[PDB]
Design a protein around this ligand. Sequence first.
Ligand SMILES: NS(=O)(=O)c1ccc(C(=O)NCCCOCCCCOCCCNc2cccc3c2C(=O)N([C@@H]2CCC(=O)NC2=O)C3=O)cc1
Ligand SMILES: [Zn+2]
Length: 257
Amino acid sequence: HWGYGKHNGPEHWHKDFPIAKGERQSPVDIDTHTAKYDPSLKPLSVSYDQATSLRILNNGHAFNVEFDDSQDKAVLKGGPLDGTYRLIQFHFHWGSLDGQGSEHTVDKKKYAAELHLVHWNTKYGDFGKAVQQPDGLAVLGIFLKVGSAKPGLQKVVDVLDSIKTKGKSADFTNFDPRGLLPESLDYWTYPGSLTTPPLLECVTWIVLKEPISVSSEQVLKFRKLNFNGEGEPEELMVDNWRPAQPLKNRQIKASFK
Ligand SMILES: NS(=O)(=O)c1ccc(C(=O)NCCCOCCCCOCCCNc2cccc3c2C(=O)N([C@@H]2CCC(=O)NC2=O)C3=O)cc1
Ligand SMILES: [Zn+2]
């Protein structure tokens, strides 16, 4: 099926998912000089103080920390969003070396990794119905650079040894996503898509300007994961990022002057 290699990677996805060549695909390069400050944007509200993580899973493309989204507990609102969006999962994209890994780029700059906190619009009842709507999803994207360690990430890092290969999953309760956020909530925002197949165009992207720093040891543990299942030839899970796509007729707004 689909993946990140020469024969099933991003340049091949359009064959099974022709939306891959659509009009609002993600990620994109963020040209910081053509993004315009929008004063009509309300402050962004990230309310994670009562998030309930459940499980961590290696799906063969990344690892997902999945949350209990059956009540309003961890919500994104404000900024470009109408109403309330509920956190369902987070995951990362990363490279084989620190010089690549992010999906969005900033004036063509690639970061070592990118965190995606995935939320669905509560007006649509749940995730499955939300991905049938052009405003069904909001993804909060956070860049990762290599430097000082991020303490709030270590609990994720230390569990990866238990989910090395595709299909493995583990209990993962009481993880606090607030420990993954940078100081500033300055952001860019634009309408786009899921960056993995089915590549559905239902996402309001909110990409934070300030990256978080993680240590080399932490990202190296990310790179010890496997794309393959147990008992198959080992393919290290690295470079699971889609390259930037045509902006076409879209405007990126800045939340800051
Ligand atoms: N990186 S990121 O952006 O943050 C990011 C990226 C991704 C995510 C994420 O959530 N991914 C998970 C994706 C969830 O979406 C799934 C939506 C699925 C929609 O339904 C598919 C239904 C398929 N059925 C069809 C459809 C059309 C035609 C046919 C059929 C079908 O069956 N047949 C026959 C029938 C019977 C049989 O017996 N044989 C056959 O052939 C057909 O003729 C989150 C964040
Ligand atoms: Zn993603």
